[PDB]
Each structure stands twice: as structure tokens, then as C-alpha cells.
Amino acid sequence: SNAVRIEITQGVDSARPIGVVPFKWAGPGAAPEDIGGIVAADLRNSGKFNPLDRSRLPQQPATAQEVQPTAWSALGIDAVVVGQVTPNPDGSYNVAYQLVDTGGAPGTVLAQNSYKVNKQWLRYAGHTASDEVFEKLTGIKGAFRTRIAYVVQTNGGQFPYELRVSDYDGYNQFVVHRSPQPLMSPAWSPDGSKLAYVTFESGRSALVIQTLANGAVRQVASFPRHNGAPAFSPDGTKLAFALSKTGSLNLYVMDLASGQIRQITDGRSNNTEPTWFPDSQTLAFTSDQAGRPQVYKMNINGGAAQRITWEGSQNQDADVSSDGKFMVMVSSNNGQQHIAKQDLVTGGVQVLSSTFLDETPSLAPNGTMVIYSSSQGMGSVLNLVSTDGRFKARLPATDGQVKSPAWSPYL
Ligand SMILES: [K+]
Ligand code: NA
């Protein structure tokens, strides 16, 4: 199934032109998929390419040698993707692509690969070709094999809330957990094998970690009042989260090997929404110690908290990039609530989104794209915005109200 579907609302008119030719299907009858279409959709979804419309291709070469570079260079296109899909006698498929230069080294094969995959993984093969083309031309690792987690409120009676996972483009959706009560704040382990989330099934909040492959569930915390806002450390050793049992929200860290929980804040201010820096020892977090929520930074091993958001009436729910050079967050000014980016090297802030009641932003693992949600009151949709603010897309769920996204790590 694929309930979440990307609808581009603001394309990048000047994005790098590229030719993506339909792949040559070697079997009988109709091709099982349209791999060239997946590659073009992935490169367009990144906000960094403008694949030529299939109806305007100057030729449809089935091999690298058939590419006529002058036909593409004449259109301002300096690279062309061609490919082949062949059924194997064992019932599997070989999905091959070649990236051909049509610029300064016309006809040269810049990159190529061939993937032996079972039917279930044909989309994954297409995404692998996209990832290689994207990285070969931009020097940035591709995110097309990644997944998203999100919560859908269906129209159903007994278990209306569903924590789900899908590919980043909505395909291959599956249900992680269904509940009569709201599910909130999913967070990925860095190896992509587990999701921490908050459940209200007992009637009050409980933080749990579910292993996706086998559905195993580990209880973390169910103390009185609020338990939530989980974040896994990048090194795989710790889970940070917030508990308000002390009359005020404090940050806690659980050592995943021992299950031991340590309290790392114990002041009067509410401290919540932890997000890790790449070192697995520094956290950004939300605090009300300056009145309206702002984002602070602290080392889990001791030392004072440092305020880092000095611009704007209110800032919260941060997500620090995988490289630690910037973060995205929810910035509120003049009654407007939008996704913003703060450069942690230059200190500057840029508002990225223009939708209504924007919340819970999550960065793709290459730092190029943000997934977030926008509340409609009763309803909700997901949205995408590039970290440079030029690309925008909306991500509604066909079967319900969707919110609380989290972008997976590289898979
Ligand atoms: K506190
Ligand atoms: Na992050």
C-alpha cells in the first residue's frame, strides 16, 4: 500500500537538467515496473534535478553506446541515465543503469551498476540507481532508499491510531502499531532497526522501543504524568527522553545495554525535546527557562546549559543535522508557526515553510530535505521543504489524518 503520496507545490525551475530514459525491459509482455520513472521521480523529489519530460526526449537509447551526446548537450543536458531490466531464470531480476556524460567527456560512462533483486525489491533497485546517480553528480549521499515513520488517525472504530512506516516516497507502507489511543513522537535508532514512540494505551503516557522486523517491544518509562520526546544517540548506546514526574520536565538518558536510567537535568525549568549532536554526548533541547520556549545545548556529562536560539519570540522541537553544522526547528513569530533552519556555524536563521501550524520537523539523513506536519485542526498532512527553502511538496494520507513524522537514517 501507499497512503502517503508526494505532490510538489513549489518546484526548482533552475534545477540541474538531466536525461532519464525509460529502461529497456528484456522479458515478454509489459515491464513489471517503470524503473526509469522511479529514477526521474527520485531526482526531481530531491529538489536538485529537473529530469526532461519523457515526451521531449530526443531519443530513447537502450544502451550507453546508443546515446548521441550532441542531442542532449544541445538542450543543456550534460548527463543521461539509460538502463535495462532483465528477468533471470531463477525468477529474480537484474536492474542495470549506466550514467553517460553528454558534456565535457561525451559518451564516457561516469557510473554504472547492476542489481540482482527479487520482485519485492524492484523499487529499491530503482532507488539504488537514483542514489548512485545523485551522489556521482552532487557529491552528496542519496536518501532514496530511506524510510519515513508517521502516525495516521483512520476513520476506524477500535484502533483508529496507527504508527506506520513507508519508503520516503510513500510506497511499501506497513503498520508498526495500532492503538485505541494516540501514538506520538516516533524516533529511529541509528541502524534503522527500531522505533521509540509514546503510547497512551494504559490511559497515561508510556515510552517504548519496538524492533520493526519482529514486533518486539521494550518498555522504557511509564512514570506519573508525562513520558516522551525520545531520541537515540548516533553511536547506538543511549536513548534520551523527557519525564515530568518531578513537577517539571527533565531530560533522562537510558543506557540501552544495561537499561539504567540517569537524570541529566534537575532544575526548575521544563527541559524537553532532546536532539543529539554527532558526538553522542551533546544534546540540543527545548527549555522554558527564558519564558517562551527556546533551544539550549548541554553536554550529558556535566556543565551548564547554553542558549543557542537568540533570534525569534519562540523556538522549539529542534533536529540537529547528521553533520552538526545546522538544525531545523519550529520558530514562532507574530502568531505564525513555521519550520526554520539555524546555521550552527554562522548563527543565521532562515524560515523555510509557509504552511499553517507547522510542527515536528525531521531531517533526511543527507541534510537536504525536511519532512514535517501541518495541523488542519481536526485533520493533518505531512509536508516537505528543502533545507535551502526552494523546493516544497505536500504529503497527505489517502486514508486519514497524518502527523508526527520521522525520517529514517540511511538504510
Ligand atoms: K526540570
Ligand atoms: Na539528527
UniProtKB/TrEMBL annotation:
Entry annotated with the keyword Transit peptide: no
Domain TolB N-terminal: from-to ranges: 4-102
Localization, UniProt: Periplasm
UniProt keyword Methyltransferase, yes or no: no
Protein keywords: Cell cycle, Cell division, Periplasm, Signal
GO biological process: cell division; protein import
SUPFAM superfamilies assigned: TolB, N-terminal domain, Tricorn protease N-terminal domain
A cellular component annotation (GO) from this entry: periplasmic space
Family per record: Belongs to the TolB family.
Known partners and oligomeric status: The Tol-Pal system is composed of five core proteins: the inner membrane proteins TolA, TolQ and TolR, the periplasmic protein TolB and the outer membrane protein Pal. They form a network linking the inner and outer membranes and the peptidoglycan layer.
Function: Part of the Tol-Pal system, which plays a role in outer membrane invagination during cell division and is important for maintaining outer membrane integrity. TolB occupies a key intermediary position in the Tol-Pal system because it communicates directly with both membrane-embedded components, Pal in the outer membrane and TolA in the inner membrane.
Protein name: Tol-Pal system protein TolB
